[PDB]
Amino acid sequence: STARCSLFGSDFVNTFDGSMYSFAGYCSYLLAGGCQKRSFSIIGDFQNGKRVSLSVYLGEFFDIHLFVNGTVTQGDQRVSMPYASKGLYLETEAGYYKLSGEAYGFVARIDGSGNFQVLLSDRYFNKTCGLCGNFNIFAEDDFMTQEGTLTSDPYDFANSWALSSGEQWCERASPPSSSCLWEQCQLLKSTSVFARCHPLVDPEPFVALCEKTLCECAGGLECACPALLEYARTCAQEGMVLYGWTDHSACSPVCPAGMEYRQCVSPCARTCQSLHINEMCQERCVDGCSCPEGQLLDEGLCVESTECPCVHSGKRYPPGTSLSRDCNTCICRNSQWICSNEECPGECLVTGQSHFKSFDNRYFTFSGICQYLLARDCQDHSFSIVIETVQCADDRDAVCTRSVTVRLPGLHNSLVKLKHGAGVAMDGQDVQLPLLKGDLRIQHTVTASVRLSYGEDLQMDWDGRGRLLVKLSPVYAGKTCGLCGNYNGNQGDDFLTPSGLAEPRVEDFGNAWKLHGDCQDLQKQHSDPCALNPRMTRFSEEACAVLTSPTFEACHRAVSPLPYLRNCRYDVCSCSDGRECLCGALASYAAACAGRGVRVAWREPGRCELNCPKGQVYLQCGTPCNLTCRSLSYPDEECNEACLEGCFCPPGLYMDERGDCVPKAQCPCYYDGEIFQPEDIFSDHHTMCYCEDGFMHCTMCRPPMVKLVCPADNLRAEGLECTKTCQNYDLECMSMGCVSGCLCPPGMVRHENRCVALERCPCFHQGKEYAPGETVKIGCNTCVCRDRKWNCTDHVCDATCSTIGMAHYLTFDGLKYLFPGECQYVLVQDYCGSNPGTFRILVGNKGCSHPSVKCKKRVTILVEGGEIELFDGEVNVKRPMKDETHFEVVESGRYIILLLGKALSVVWDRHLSISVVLKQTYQEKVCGLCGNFDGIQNNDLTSSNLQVEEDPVDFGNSWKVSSQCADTRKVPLDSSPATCHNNIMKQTMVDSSCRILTSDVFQDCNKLVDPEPYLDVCIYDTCSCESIGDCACFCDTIAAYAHVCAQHGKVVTWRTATLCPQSCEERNLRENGYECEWRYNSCAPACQVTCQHPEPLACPVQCVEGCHAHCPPGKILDELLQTCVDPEDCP
Ligand SMILES: *[C@@H]1O[C@H](CO)[C@@H](O[C@@H]2O[C@H](CO)[C@@H](O[C@@H]3O[C@H](CO)[C@@H](O)[C@H](O)[C@@H]3O)[C@H](O)[C@H]2NC(C)=O)[C@H](O)[C@H]1NC(C)=O
Ligand SMILES: *[C@@H]1O[C@H](CO)[C@@H](O)[C@H](O)[C@H]1NC(C)=O
Ligand SMILES: *[C@@H]1O[C@H](CO)[C@@H](O)[C@H](O)[C@H]1NC(C)=O
Ligand SMILES: *[C@@H]1O[C@H](CO)[C@@H](O)[C@H](O)[C@H]1NC(C)=O
Ligand SMILES: *[C@@H]1O[C@H](CO)[C@@H](O)[C@H](O)[C@H]1NC(C)=O
Ligand SMILES: [Ca+2]
Ligand SMILES: [Ca+2]
Ligand SMILES: [Ca+2]
């Protein structure tokens, strides 16, 4: 139940108990709020006697103003409409500005006419003490003045609740001294439609209100409409709702547009862009506007059902607009963004100090000093790009790439070596660019950057300092080994190694691709070079921040700047010269943007001016086809290039051999691989040519293993420069000419120092070596080391969607992202498409924009039967599900493990951590905030409208269960969130405290599951949380990481007496003294057979920390009394 008080009419009031009167004040009087423990207060602002604005104050800190013309303020600043915040979801319900606070309990509406409203909860029975009268069934005692004296004059009682504020003084409001046939409202007691209500609230007070209005009622046929509408609303709230009224004489309650004032319009209000979530429309009917019928409510006005625009990247799109992604394209069907399914060309950017972007985008930093295999065909060896990395800037965390050694085997056996400084060394001797061959076309670019180009499949962009940009066509598809990983479009597996197993650590994966056996394997890959050079932190942050500024806002939606921001920070803190490396990082992000399709200037005086040579000009977005006298000499070769942003020359000019461009029609006449000056006639025995313009117009020691050095024929044999070790036997070793050293017998590889047979050499996993025939367990799969290669058993294991922290999620395929949501979102769901759905898990929360101490997650599990809502700290089942057979509520440890079906095994932390575990059955059939469980991480941001979104914010906003609540604003901030950014003191302590994840206790597990996602989740969600007393915000993240570790059989006992202590004393506390049975076990077992659950169950998680009773062998545990007793004393 709930009461209702409305400041309807013109200066009228209706208390919570029915008493009504007139009062035109000016001092923003207190409508409702307890007088003992206020904790919040609805204030009805008044202007010159008119009802202007309805304010709500929470405690003494949060101020919200609603106004009657739709504008909103926080007290000193304006805000947009949906404006979800700490409670107080201010929305538009049915054309009326609704302000809903449920944690406290009330709902404030302001319809077009300006009639306020309030729906206080029963828990304020006899407790509210505002201007709307105390909420007691007795309606005659609703003039309780703030002084505590019950008066009879309404104006005295009303003025006793005035609330002045600073400039807004006030005085005793007094009734206007104005005195006085439209008898229309007499029908309140005559017409049948109203007559039905007579058993309910009587009309006589409303007839008196008529007479009072009618006395003046300045206007025409309006003296009655306010009272009639108020009576109808009061009757509807009291029970039955007057159907059919407003068809006789009412003023047609105003609506913004699409005039459809309709009694009992469901607030669910299926709108234009909604997920069609049925069964959540349980909210009671409320009188309000609506769309005519066939129309559907769009963002603003009503539009036709067949006109719903598609939404992508947080903007609207008329049907059929069909914008194009990188290489695929979408069509914008009826809000479905049907998209193509081609394969785009890959790229393996290697820019920066040590930064890689695998073909399947897997931004990572390795920083190893050796020769590493970047990309290779493997399936059909046709190119073996290899990089040689060497430390720069006399700092450990600075490992540039010095050269590249492409090994195109098609052209006999070429060894094109893109040297430092943009030189090329085809098979030893340097070569004068441009160069042509069978298909090789290495040549300069507009910028000083060699561009190797094989037969329209390879395309490199070496640039000297180091920028390799290997680009492959879809032909190579999923056949490409090397540091760029298989080019199969899935970013998850791009950490594979020659042994055939993905390395969880970047270091192991990188070391796997060594060529020289003597190079040092990389240890922990430091993430913060700034720590070694503190003087650079300020400049690094303040300079790389530009990547997250309006200058790059256009590209922000196309390419997420986070990896590029991290790379810029690392380079600036690590590079030898801050200026050049900063410009390189910014140019890298800009180039990524431009290649995606968006061009950003980002180049300003001082910052990164290109400073083109005299005679050249910058002209961002220039054309490269022309701008070479050679181009004139060969005017029918090709032109299929685009904007390059290089240093071109003024129109009408032409690059010459020397480099200048003053030549316009005085150009060399490149011909037969020779240079001819202008007008250089020439006549051989079978032709005669003259060079005009630019075109050459023409007519007519240690036994027992054998020792060999090399044949020394042309320095081809493999000397000691590369000795085939089983760790690198498969890899293509570099060829630096014969060194004339030792070598193992041809039919067996080297190992350590003793040469051993190839079939007998251990594989590797996490650095550790495993001898042939051994085996290792990965998840629910086991692998055996054979021929230095892992043979794994393929059983797709259960995927675990999670919501680490409050703003971070972990998809089934493994993607982790940030989404600070407030509304109710679809965590998991199988109502994706043609497949008939079976369940929907919604993870709606409250006050969780910024992860806060009071944030709480409300999970509603709409299984086939009905809601299984989880809230607070216990499970509620507000529906008997159709098949209660498959339903358990095992609450081992601190968790509420559920088994809602054969596969669905939701695991709950009794707090803000929720895990959904699915089996092979729900593969590629699920959708929501946790991807689709297809094994591909890239396609896990697919929005509700079946399009991939770069920014996780838009993708999350696409999954809100409602469609009017609010959309999380795309915050451009970076690491060090708001409460973390400008604190330093809090930033540092948070960073240090959220480092236990890398402590010794977690050290054993860190090598099995990287903590960086959880490090971020802890640095975030801990600065955001103002943990006071309740220290769960920080502790919960660590506990979640420990739980993940335990899932991998790496139990960690990290809790202490001073670090997130967890006690169990209260359980053992019993009338019999002390039981000593309930103790905290860091891991504990899974669901334990108990009196209420004698039979065993297949729990999703084998181990779960928390309290548990270590009962002796007999007398298994009970449930109600939380004590273990003989099996007899239970059912
Ligand atoms: C809905 O009603 C509210 C309440 O009247 C309107 O707020 C008022 O908006 C006007 C528009 O500019 C404000 O005028 C400006 O005030 C500032 C500060 O006093 C002054 O420096 C300017 O020169 C200008 O006069 C006015 O202050 C403001 N009153 C408030 C906030 O109490 C609101 O504009 C209305 N909605 C719409 C859409 O108009
Ligand atoms: C209102 O409060 C007073 C004192 O707390 C109490 O005596 C009285 O019974 C209350 N009224 C109702 C209806 O509970
Ligand atoms: C170069 O190409 C541009 C674009 O097609 C064209 O306008 C121009 O005439 C060409 N020649 C020169 C010398 O710029
Ligand atoms: C896996 O083992 C089976 C049985 O020994 C064998 O037939 C199969 O070839 C093995 N797979 C690989 C990739 O070696
Ligand atoms: C937790 O329980 C398991 C199995 O019951 C046991 O092996 C382990 O020693 C326990 N740990 C502690 C700290 O009691
Ligand atoms: Ca009362
Ligand atoms: Ca891949
Ligand atoms: Ca997927």
- Give dist(CA 1015, CA 537) in Å, integer: 20
User: Residues for the chain: how many in total?
Assistant: 1131
Q: In angstroms, rounded to a whole number, what is the distance separating the alpha carbons of residues 653 and 555?
A: 33
Which DSSP helix (H) or strand (E) runs through 1012? helix 1012-1019
Full 3-state SS string of 383-423: CCCEEEEEECCCCCCCEEEEEECCCCCCCCCCCCCECCCCC
Q: What 3-state class would DSSP assign to 1107? A: strand
Element (H, E) at 763: strand 763-765
Taking Cα atoms as reference points, which of 363, 362, 402 lies closest to residue 386? 402
C-beta of residue 949 within 8 angstroms of C-beta of residue 815: no
For 642, the token pair is 């685009």
C-alpha dihedral sign at 1103, 1104, 1110, 1111: negative
Q: Is the bond into 534 cis (omega within 30 degrees of 0)?
A: no
Q: What angle do CA 1114, 1119, 1121 make, to 5 degrees?
A: 90
Ligand that lies nearest to the alpha carbon of residue 1081, given by its number in the listed order: 5
Spatial separation of the C-alpha atoms in residues 956 and 928, rounded to whole Å: 9
Nearest CA to ligand 2 atom 2: 126
**Which amino acids bring their CB within 6 angstroms of ligand 5?**
1081-1085
**For residue 935, how many C-alpha atoms fall within 13 Å in the half-sphere facing its CB?**
9
Ligand 2 atom with the smallest distance to the CA of 138 is 13
Intra-chain end-to-end CA distance of the chain, in Å: 38
Rounded to the nearest 10 degrees, the angle between the axes of helix 562-574 and helix 537-544 is 150
CB distance 437 to 481 below 8 Å: no
Question: Do the beta carbons of residue 871 and residue 856 sit within 8 Å?
Answer: yes
Residue closest by Cα to atom 1 of ligand 1:
69
Cβ atoms of 275 and 961 within 8 Å: the answer is yes
List, as one string, the DSSP characters of 1028-1089: SS--HHHHHHHHHHHHHHHHTT-------SSSS----HHHHEETTEE---EEEESS--SS--
586: helix, strand or coil: helix
User: How far is 342 from 327, CA to CA, in rounded Å?
Assistant: 7
- Cα 675 to averaged position of ligand 2 atoms, centre (Å): 108
Cα-based distances in Å from 672 to 666, 675, 685, 694: 19, 9, 15, 14
d(CA 77, CA 63): 11
Buried/exposed 95-130: b ≥16 CB within 10 Å, e otherwise: bbbbbbbeebebbbbbbbbbbbbbbbbeebeebbbb
Instruction: Classify residue 993 as exposed, middle or buried by CB count within 10 Å of its CB (0-12, 13-18, 19+).
Output: middle
- How far apart are the CA of 950 and the centre of ligand 8, in A? 14
Q: 344: CA distance to ligand 8 center in Å?
A: 18
CA 1092, CA 117: separation in Å to the nearest integer? 49
147: CA distance to ligand 2 center in Å? 16
Cβ neighbors of 979 (< 8 A, separation 6 or more) are: 850, 986, 1023, 1024, 1026
35 Cβ inside 6 Å of ligand 2: no
Angle at the Cα of 952 (from 950 to 955), degrees rounded to 5? 90
73 — phi, psi (to 5°)?
Answer: -145, 155
How far, in Å, from the CA of 112 to the mean position of ligand 1? 19
Joined together, the tokens standing for residue 133 give 């009268």
Sort 1076 into a burial class: Cβ within 10 Å, 0-12 / 13-18 / 19+.
exposed
d(CA 626, CA 645): 14
What is the torsion angle, in degrees rounded to the nearest 10, for the CA atoms of residue 114, residue 120, residue 125 and residue 131?
Answer: -30
The CA distances from residue 1000 to 696, 1005, 1014, 1047, 1084, in Å, are 74, 9, 16, 19, 21
Q: Is 847 left (phi over 0), alpha (psi -120 to 50) or beta?
A: left
What is the structure's resolution, reported in angstroms to one decimal? Answer: 3.2
> Is the Cβ atom of 136 under 6 angstroms away from ligand 2?
yes
C-alpha 205/C-alpha 952 separation (Å) is: 56
Alpha-carbon distances of 119 from 460, 521, 748, rounded to whole Å: 67, 68, 84
Tokens linked to 109: 């509406």
Sequential DSSP letters for 286-353? EEE----SSEEE-SSSEEEGGG--EEETTEEE-TT---B-SS-BB---TT---B------EE----TT
Q: Starting at the earlier edge strand, list the strands of the sheet with 106-110.
A: 89-92, 97-101, 106-110
Q: Is residue 845 exposed (0-12), middle (13-18) or buried (19+ Cβ within 10 Å)?
A: buried
Given the DSSP bridges, would you call strands 1069-1070 and 1073-1074 parallel, antiparallel or unpaired? antiparallel
Ligand 1 pocket residues where CB is under 6 Å: 67, 69, 71
Ligand 1: which atom is nearest the Cα of residue 71? 36
Longest CA–CA separation in the chain, Å: 127
Ligand nearest to the Cα of 137, by number: 6
Ligand 8 midpoint to CA 736 (Å): 44
CA 192/CA 592 separation, integer angstroms: 71
User: Going by C-beta distance under 8 Å and a sequence separation of 6 or more, which residues neighbour residue 910?
Assistant: 873, 874, 894, 895, 896
Residue nearest to atom 14 of ligand 3 (CA): 651
| Residue 629: DSSP 8-state | H
Whose CA is closest to atom 10 on ligand 3?
626
Nearest Cα residue to 471 out of 480, 481, 458: 458
CA of 1007 to the centre of ligand 8 (A): 25
Count of CA atoms in the C-beta half-sphere (13 A) of 47: 6
SS3 annotation, 926-985? CECCCCCCCCCCHHHCECCCCCECCCHHHHHHCCECCCCCCCCCCCCCCCCCHHHHCCCH
The answer to whether the beta carbons of residues 427 and 439 sit under 8 Å apart is no
Helix, strand or coil for residue 38? coil
Dist CA 492 CA 813 (whole Å)? 8
From CA 485, how far away is CA 372, in angstroms rounded? 13
Crossing angle between the packed helical segments 578-596 and 562-574, to the nearest 10 degrees:
160
Phi, psi of 962 (to 5 degrees): -75, -175
Among 1040, 1002, 937, smallest CA distance to 363 is for 937
Which protein residue has the closest C-alpha to ligand 2 atom 3? Answer: 126
CA distance 327 to 273: 27
Question: How far is 149 from 160, CA to CA, in rounded Å?
Answer: 10
The DSSP result for 344-387, as a single string, is --EE----TTT-B--SS---B-----SEEE--B-STT-----EE
Nearest to 1064 by CA among 1122, 1000, 992, 1005: 1122
Distance (Å, whole) CA 910 – CA 1043: 14
Nearest listed ligand to the Cα of residue 125: 2
**What backbone phi and psi angles, to 5 degrees, belong to 1013?**
-55, -40
CB neighbourhood size of 1027 (10 A): 14
Query: For residue 97, which amino acid is it?
Result: Y
Structural tokens at position 768 = 């550790």
CB–CB of 299/308 below 8 Å? no
Residues 21 and 12: their CA atoms lie apart, in Å, by: 6
In angstroms and rounded to an integer, the radius of gyration of the C-alpha atoms of the chain is: 37
Query: Of all protein residues, whose CA lies closest to atom 13 belonging to ligand 5?
Result: 1081
Which residue's alpha carbon is nearest to atom 2 within ligand 3?
A: 626
Distance, CA of 1129 to CA of 1131 (rounded, Å): 7
Task: Please name which of 909, 919, 901 lies closest in space to residue 875, comparing C-alpha atoms.
Answer: 909
DSSP string, 538-569: HHHHHHHGGGGSGGGHHHHTTS-SHHHHHHHH
Q: In degrees, to the nearest 5, what angle opens at C-alpha 204 toward C-alphas 198 and 209?
A: 130
CA of 431 to the centre of ligand 3 (A): 29
Distances in Å between the Cα of 922 and the Cα atoms of 779, 843, 884 are 18, 19, 21
Q: Is 858 exposed, middle or buried (0-12, 13-18, 19+ CB in 10 A)?
A: middle
Backbone angles phi, psi at 680, to 5 degrees: -115, 90
In this structure, what token pair is assigned to residue 1034?
Answer: 């920080």
- Among the atoms of ligand 3, which is closest to the Cα of residue 654? 13
CA-to-CA dists, residue 941 to 807, 927, 938, 949, angstroms: 15, 10, 7, 6
> In sequence order, what DSSP letters do the residues of 216-240 get, joined into one string?
H--SSTTSSHHHHHHHHHHHHHHSS
3-state SS class at 986: helix
Does residue 60 contact residue 53 with C-beta atoms inside 8 Å? Answer: no
Ligand whose nearest atom lies closest to the CA of 500: 4
Q: Angle between the 1032-1047 and 1012-1019 helix axes, to the nearest 10 degrees?
A: 170
Residues 6+ apart with CB under 8 A from 798: 780, 903, 905, 917, 918, 919, 920, 1100
The single residue listed with the structure tokens 């005009």 is 692
**C-alpha closest to that of 328 among 344, 345, 346:** 344
**Residue linked to tokens 């599951």:** 1009
Give burial (CB, 10 Å; 0-12/13-18/19+) of 1064: middle
Q: How many angstroms separate the CA atoms of 168 and 26, rounded?
A: 9
Buried-exposed string 370-382: b where 16+ CB fall within 10 A, e elsewhere: bbbbbbbbbeeeb
Q: Is 157 helix (H, G, I), strand (E, B) or coil?
A: helix
| CA–CA distance, 357 with 877 (Å, rounded to integer) | 47
Cis check: omega of the bond before 972, within 30 degrees of 0: no
**Closest ligand 3 atom, CA of 664?**
13
Beta carbons within 10 angstroms of residue 200's beta carbon: 16
- CA–CA gap between residue 758 and residue 769 (Å, rounded): 15
Q: Is 623 in the pocket of ligand 3 (CB under 6 A)?
A: yes
Does residue 626 line the site of ligand 3, with CB under 6 A? Answer: yes
> How far is residue 1021's CA from residue 1018's CA, in Å, rounded to a whole number?
6
CB 800 within 8 A of CB 816: no
Strand partners, 400: 390
Number of helices (H), then strands (E), belonging to the chain: the values are 17, 44
Distance of CA 100 from the midpoint of ligand 1 (Å): 25
User: Solved by what technique?
Assistant: cryo-EM
Question: Does the Cβ of 126 fall within 6 Å of ligand 2?
Answer: yes
Nearest CA to ligand 3 atom 1: 626
Q: Which neighbouring-strand residues pair with 87?
A: 85
Contact between 383 and 373 under an 8 Å Cβ cutoff? The reply is no
Of 1078, 1083, 1088, 1103, the one to substitute when testing ligand 5's pocket (max ligand atoms within 8 A of C-beta) is 1083
